[PDB]
Amino acid sequence: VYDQVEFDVPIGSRGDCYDRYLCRVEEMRQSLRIIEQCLNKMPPGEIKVDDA
Amino acid sequence: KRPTVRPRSDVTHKQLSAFGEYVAEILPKYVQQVQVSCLDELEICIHPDGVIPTLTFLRDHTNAQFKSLADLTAVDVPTRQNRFEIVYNLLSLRFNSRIRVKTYADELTPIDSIVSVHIAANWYEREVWDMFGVFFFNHPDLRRILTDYGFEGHPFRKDFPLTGYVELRYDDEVKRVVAEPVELAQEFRKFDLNSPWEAFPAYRQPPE
Amino acid sequence: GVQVSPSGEKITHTGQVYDEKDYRRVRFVDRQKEVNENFAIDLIAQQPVNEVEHRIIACDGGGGALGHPKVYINLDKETKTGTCGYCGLQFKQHH
Amino acid sequence: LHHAVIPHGKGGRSSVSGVVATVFGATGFLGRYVVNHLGRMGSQVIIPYRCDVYDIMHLRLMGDLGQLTFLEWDARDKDSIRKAVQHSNVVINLIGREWETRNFDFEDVFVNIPRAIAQASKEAGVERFIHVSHLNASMKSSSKSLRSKAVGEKEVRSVFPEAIIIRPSDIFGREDRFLNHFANYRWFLAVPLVSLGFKTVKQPVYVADVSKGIVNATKDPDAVGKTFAFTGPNRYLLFHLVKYIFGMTHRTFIPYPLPLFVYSWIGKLFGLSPFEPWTTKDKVERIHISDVMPTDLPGLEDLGVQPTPLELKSIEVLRRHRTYRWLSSEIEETKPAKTVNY
Amino acid sequence: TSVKPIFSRDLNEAKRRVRELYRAWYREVPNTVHLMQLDITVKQGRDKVREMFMKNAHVTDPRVVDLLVIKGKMELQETIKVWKQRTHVMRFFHETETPRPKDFLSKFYMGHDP
Amino acid sequence: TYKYVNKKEQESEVDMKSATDNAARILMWTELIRGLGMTLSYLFREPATINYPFEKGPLSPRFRGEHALRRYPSGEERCIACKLCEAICPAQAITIEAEPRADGSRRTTRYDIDMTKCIYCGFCQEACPVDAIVEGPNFEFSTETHEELLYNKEKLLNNGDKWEAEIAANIQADYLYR
Amino acid sequence: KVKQDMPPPGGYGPIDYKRNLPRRGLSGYSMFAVGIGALIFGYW
Amino acid sequence: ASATRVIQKLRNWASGQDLQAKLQLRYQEIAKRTQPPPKLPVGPSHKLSNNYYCTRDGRREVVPPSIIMSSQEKKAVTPAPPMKRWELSKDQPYL
Amino acid sequence: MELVEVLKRGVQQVTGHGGLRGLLRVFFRANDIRIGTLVGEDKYGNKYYEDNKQFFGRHRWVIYTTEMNGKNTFWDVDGSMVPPEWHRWLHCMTDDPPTTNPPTARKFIWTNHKFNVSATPEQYVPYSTTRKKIHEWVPPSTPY
Amino acid sequence: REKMFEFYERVSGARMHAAYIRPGGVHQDLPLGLLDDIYEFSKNFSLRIDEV
């Protein structure tokens, strides 16, 4: 369901160790953005496919 | 609408058929078969002579641009004469598509190395050589990569035993790790799991 | 119960016990033979036979979903009890 | 055979060899080689130990899961000796000291303890009893330890008439007190040799051969009751040996003579050490008691072992006695010692 | 019976690459023994080299001799660059392995194997 | 949608006000003083440590720990030697033998788990149709020898009797999620 | 009645995720002004 | 939580944040460690009727791959339409 | 002022273990002198305390007995000494102690817990629980 | 991370190797009260990223 949760992809400008560090740090913030949506949009239902 | 069966799509399968014909018209010297699975994945099966030209065109052509080598690997099928199927999974970021290019090899028929096309392949071709013993021409540094130094054999070949032939222990007499023939306190128990009843009528083979 | 062999080793509920001359007895020197002392065969024999009216009775072992798969036992053979194939409980028809 | 001792497998660690040996003295220099040879072929090994558990750790990895059984014992307590030899089909005695302590003298170690073990093994119903002694064991011997060994042999054969007696010469190996003893003379500038070492003959034997023939005696049908002489394939004068050793360590060799009584008196000083003596009077005597000539006794080759020359294996013992300048010098750079047929 | 060559066009052109590999292995024993501080002699090491080359004395397919030469160069490189250790080099000498008797009776006494 | 992590070149002009700020940043080590402040604040926070072994880390009723063989309330073994735990075990860690008992029951004569092959996946717990094999909540059972970690049937039944009081309540707290 | 683990009615309150490192401290002039004052008085 | 109000001011200022609102440690706001029993819902195929398996079976809808070419003017095509360029974030384009 | 309240709790904790002997005993055994509410005690002598004002993870704790199964555990305490009824409460797998929600009684449940017996003479020793499979022929005991 | 390992254990029973996502769905449903704890952790986590 990644095509239903809204988030931004961090991009770098110099391609060195510092930009990658900033991208990872900004991804952790963007995962937090996703988690908030999952917690509110969690639906009811079964958990494994109804096919035994 | 069936809440248990995977949505089928429609357009992607038609698009990948059009590109599969495209690739086959342009490289008729190398292409042996083109297919698209029900998962909607395009496969090009080429003569091994065509590897470098085929991956070069697919990388540099303007209506392809498969610039990432997602991975390269072999499958061992002993019943075939050319028992090694070499698989290239390529990625196009321009067109957000994927493509599989397959060729074959035997024990004594090395493939050309695509390190000149995808540097990513350098270690992937070392892994095929190590695990399957498929030699690559023109590899800058072809040597084992995953097995222990001086390991004899190609352990991902189907006829290589799961536990191997030798094992290591420390020997206090000679004061070093030694190799000795494998003996297991408990043997690996092989389970015969195949059901004797056919599960997929769609894949049944003619009894000829 | 926990019988003891002539060699002095305890006999497990499966009847295993090293012989007198089996060297493998050395593993218990300065140690002990782990033996479970609640023989399930002896415990199951202590339960009383449940009497029921109908000729076919379902046993699931108790606890519902916490038991064993539910099966039915015929009670016609009025000379032996009906035994559950999972839990070993016994049943007998009232008349 | 009882069904649990029939040998299966192919003589690897997970095999079954049918040998259930209690090795008395497995915690010493020769002991680790005996246990390893027994353990590698898949033998149950019972290891009585009196030391701290830390000191038996290096033996734990010498057998597959379950094939090693460590037991605490006190040589003074008979009941603990029975506890160990109770389930064996062979008992190997390697107990021994190169010095005397407060609580155990040469008679205790070389006579009483072996007799106590053999007496309990006979009562327990053990098929084989392998007892290690010495080549120069004899009642007319200068060395106090070497006379007791001679007595001990006889006690053992009184209570276990069929005992197999092994007589090795000097055993040389990584942990020996033979080549590492002379290599350590360098700490005293010079090498005191009685009569300059030219009257003493030595025929040293490699530890792995001693241990490999001891294990071969646990299964050879034609060994019950015999006495064996385990010796190297070469006899050297002590001088040439000690000179060769310093050639292998590339240290400066400065030998000078020292009369046996002045040498014997020095050994008494080092024997006052409360720890493990660097030397003793008995160790100085034994170094100069010359190896007996081999006359009518089956040797290593009768137990299927080919003696290893002192030349093949010296460098693995002596490379750690070198300085950085010579660590990498190869075996060939050293001139071999000169042998003597007497 | 026609097949693509790897490198050599026939056994004689392949033996040229074999002797050239044997030369390189022969020149390197004295270094391996010196650098790895092995407890063997050069003569004993070089004999072991010769023994491994004679293990494959029956090969005749030229493509096979190409891939044995290819492997042997990889083995030579692992040793010259000290990617291998004492344990790895010393494995060729099977020093801890008792060798199985090759006579019927000894096999018969020892177990069910042929 | 995408964002720039390290792009900011919308260049402004260096005012005398701003240049003197850059210099004070460089000469006075201001950002390095801010970092010293953050570790000073942590010094006066309560540590997160717990007082083991007197305090324990929280666990849930599903916790996959040491194995155990369970019984019925009557004391009869639940295991009927179906061998499904053996067929599923990813590690081939379980060995089983069975035969008819003296009363005719289907029961195991052997039941081993080599706890050094086990990956503690809990799959055997799922495969068992009668809740005979479970992973209890014990996690403090390290030994001093390898051989003590090869559990035979007696050992596993003993763990069952040892831990039943607690196993039964964890299943009671979780079986409705299964 | 089905009892499944679900978010409460309305949903959960907002969660901060953006960078929030505060802007704090004296101005460039104040830092230099204090330091140069401390020297001048010390030199006197 | 147990910290005096003086140390709260000290560490709030040193960090430059309001720590008291967002503590690393957990106190009462956690969930109770013993919850009531669940009652989980069934799935869409728990019907008693109109639920033949052959009409909702996915494994049997798979087929062997289509063979486009094998050994048994036209406009040029791409493997797919070109990807759209991503748009810049409105939430925070320049971190 | 607040500093005085802190010293108040400090005094109240120093004197809250019953004398100087009590404070030394707890301090050198657990390296901790908090004052929890006694939740219960077991047949072995462990005492279980709690303080819900502490943060999750320090709000429950046990003071192990000083003698269990004949072993001296005044200094040698290990987490295997907690029996299974309290093991569940102590690990926060539940919320109610056994003093109010006792486990169901069974005739086969161990009455006496047993901690980690590794290294001792009680230690488990593995062995095969099956009986001999192949039975050998027994020769006649008489001449022919 | 010690707290996120607690969410892994409360769904699967293992701190790391959950074996929880399976072809066709997930093995078990979320235990009651788990989304509150995930939410309680998430509301405070951006302060942790700020301190780093």
Ligand SMILES: NC(=O)C1=CN([C@@H]2O[C@H](COP(=O)(O)OP(=O)(O)OC[C@H]3O[C@@H](n4cnc5c(N)ncnc54)[C@H](OP(=O)(O)O)[C@@H]3O)[C@@H](O)[C@H]2O)C=CC1
């Ligand atoms: N050069 C040689 O090594 C030669 C050796 N031999 C004989 O071979 C045997 C072993 O040689 P080596 O291995 O060098 O001897 P060690 O010096 O290695 O000691 C051997 C063993 O004796 C045990 N031991 C000694 N005294 C006692 C005691 N009072 N009670 C219990 N155990 C005791 C030691 O156990 P702990 O370590 O716990 O004391 C040790 O494990 C001896 O009989 C020795 O005389 C014969 C010819 C040459």
Ligand SMILES: CCCCCCCCCCCCO[C@@H]1O[C@H](CO)[C@@H](O[C@H]2O[C@H](CO)[C@@H](O)[C@H](O)[C@H]2O)[C@H](O)[C@H]1O
């Ligand atoms: C007038 C002066 C004359 C010169 C002195 C006469 C020579 C007497 C000393 C000879 C050398 C002593 O050197 C000593 O050798 C003994 C014999 O192995 C070693 O003895 C010990 O070494 C190590 C120590 O853990 C053990 O592994 C070994 O088994 C043990 O025997 C000592 O480590 C070494 O210090």
Ligand code: SF4
């Ligand atoms: S937890 Fe997994 S690995 Fe361990 S015994 Fe059960 S199925 Fe096998």
Ligand code: SF4
């Ligand atoms: S433990 Fe369960 S799954 Fe395993 S054999 Fe017994 S009944 Fe079958």
Ligand SMILES: [Zn+2]
């Ligand atoms: Zn039943």
